Amino acid sequence: LNPRLFSPHIIRSLLDLDAYKINMMQAIHHFYPDVSVRYELIVRSEEDASGLLDAIRQEIAHLGTLRFSDADIHYLTQHAPHLKATFLQSLRYFHFVPQEQVEMGIVKQQLRISIRGSWRDTILYETLVMAIVSEVRSRQRWAEVPADLPLKVLKTKLDQLKAEIERRGINNFSLTEMGTRRRFSSQVQRDVLACLKQEIPQWVLGTSNYHFAREFDLKPIGTIAHEWFMGHQALVNERDSQQVALERWLTAFDGMLAIAPTDTLTIDAFLNDFNRHLANAYDGVRHDSGCPFRWGDKMIAHYQQLGIDPTTKLFIFSDGLDFDQALELCEYFAGRVKISFGIGTFLTNDLANWRNAAGVEYRPLSIVIKLAECQGRPVAKISDQPEKAMCEDPIFLANLKRRFNIELDVDALIQELRHQKR
Prior knowledge:
Elements (H helix, E strand, L loop, with lengths): L18 H13 L4 E9 L5 H14 L6 H10 L5 H7 L6 H4 E6 L2 E9 H4 L2 H17 L7 H20 L6 E3 L8 H14 L4 E4 L2 H7 L9 H10 L5 H12 L6 E3 L5 H7 L2 H6 L2 E4 L4 H14 L8 E4 L5 H11 L4 E6 L1 H4 L17 E9 L2 E2 L15 H10 L6 H12 L1
Helix pairs in contact: 2-7, 8-9, 11-12
């Protein structure tokens, strides 16, 4: 393997993950120490996945050997001050048990990985497993990519970004790097962050990766993931789930950054839960599905109805962005609200359609994870793109929609019930 494309280690430390995973681990440690969960990951559209499965197993097994070092803990003590000393002391002994927590196999072809255990002990797997599957695929299938290509591609985009910012007089572009989970490799992410820091420091709000926040002295940014809201569907009554999850984030920490996603259910359900006390306490909200213009306008109107000045709140846009989409959003929201763009794939896994020797255009690995179950009960995400609703139990999902007055397609449900019985 080419040392300019791939470092010796895929996972760099137990801080080499999205910061919100550790942060949410604190909240789960505090409130839900005996709650169990099951996550499901599916890798699609890779022929003979039989072949990735060997090196993935080895890497996943290797997680069982990782530990938090005193230096990792010292780093969080200083740079993540809303983490409780008691929680950080408990990390000193923490490790994974992957032979108990992780199963994987081929289902006929896709690669399926199932992660089961306590919520506190399994929550950190998600981005580590996604980064591993991504990078193993890179090593195995895209090893001949020219080592200088990823940075050439980024440099060209950064030139065009700067040029458009100058031309259009945009003064509100802000970038939050969030490409750990689908990076081409940890080396490529490392170089990408180094380059951003060198080229556009004035526009980098920070990175979700704790390890690279350390390495480059960048601010670590977390937003709360959907799984916190989805898990509450099992822990309280479904109708109270989103509201309780909003409240409990605030009581988990003195002053942790509080940015809520709005589409675990729908924007209307979110607005009905996001009362004046919650809207003032939260620093802002994250957009992840559906039209960002309509979303942001609706959120602004909500703040204004509640007498909150939206220019004091932050919108993080994170729905598959590129820089031209981001600049459009900059113009539309200028003067009205604070903004930043949480960008993943476009930053850390973009080879500009580079073709291999056989002429195949490069695309990132298609990979999804979901929280499937909590306390042995189903949980679901609906979102503002309904076609993307996800639940293993179609009766649960139908009931959850009914409790939130979300339109239910009965004919589709009947087909889903008949399918499941077979």
